[PDB]
Amino acid sequence: VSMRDMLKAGVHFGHQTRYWNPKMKPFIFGARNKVHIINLEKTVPMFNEALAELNKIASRKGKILFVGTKRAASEAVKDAALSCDQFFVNHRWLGGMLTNWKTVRQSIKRLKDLETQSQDGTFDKLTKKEALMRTRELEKLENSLGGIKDMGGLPDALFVIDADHEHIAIKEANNLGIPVFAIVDTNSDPDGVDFVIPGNDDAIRAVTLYLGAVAATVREGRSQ
RNA sequence: GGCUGUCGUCAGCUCGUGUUGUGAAAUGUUGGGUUAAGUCCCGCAACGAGCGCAACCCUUAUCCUUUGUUGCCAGCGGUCC
Ligand SMILES: [Mg+2]
Ligand SMILES: [Mg+2]
Ligand SMILES: [Mg+2]
Ligand SMILES: [Mg+2]
Ligand SMILES: [Mg+2]
Ligand SMILES: [Mg+2]
Known about the structure:
Blueprint: H1 3-9, E1 13-16, E2 28-31, E3 35-38, H2 40-59, E4 64-67, H3 74-83, E5 87-89, H4 101-118, H5 129-145, E6 157-160, H6 167-175, E7 180-184, E8 195-198, H7 204-223
This protein binds magnesium ion (6 copies).
The structure holds one RNA strand.
PDB class: ribosome
Keywords: Antibiotic, Initiator tRNA, Complex, Macromolecule, ribosome
Entry title: E. coli 70S ribosome bound to thermorubin and fMet-tRNA
């Protein structure tokens, strides 16, 4: 990645100053019309170090869970995780997805079963309205667990867009000792993140930049 | 012991695992709506489950098929009606 690419992507744009987290002071460059400006001179090396560590994780045949559920980030994170053969959560994070994996995997199994019943013709022997009921259940399980249906266990890393919004997932990973790589905007707490990447987590341009880079890095880790 | 009344056929009562709290406990089960209903949808540090709700049972209202006496009499003939 390059500083100029980041800047044209809008990565340097933090939040308004009245909403800052004071712990984000070392990564703030200044203010522009009451809005904090992130120091890309910190962002570039820190992102490059996160990229190298993620490359190593993908090289050990590791699973990376992409987490972003903001409306701006959902489709992009899904595309990024799919294009690099990884796992994602792009709709509401379910409390206990990781710390209560022994329970959530049962819903994943039910997702598998309902998907086969949708490609097995078992839905035809159903009383029409129950076909719609099971379709609703399949669709909701797909909304919430589609991205992790084949994860098969705890991931080896989390890549998070907007640490503040995804605080539950960060907390769960910390509880289970799973390294966290996050875009940490100026309003956010960097304390639960092992690899902090200071930057905008709201605009699609910046989000897509981060995600494309992470997907490419894990692809190179797999290929190498 | 068994059996029964009663709140009350009221919509409630819980649990596992997760998480919160030093703890009693909490969350789930609250919230926005909706329903006869913890009924359902949406949300949501909860994810799920069980007993309850509902359904499955009996009866009643319509129709079809089968059978046709001890029950029936529309069409035919006969009458002691
Ligand atoms: Mg209650
Ligand atoms: Mg309670
Ligand atoms: Mg409510
Ligand atoms: Mg119920
Ligand atoms: Mg609820
Ligand atoms: Mg009942």
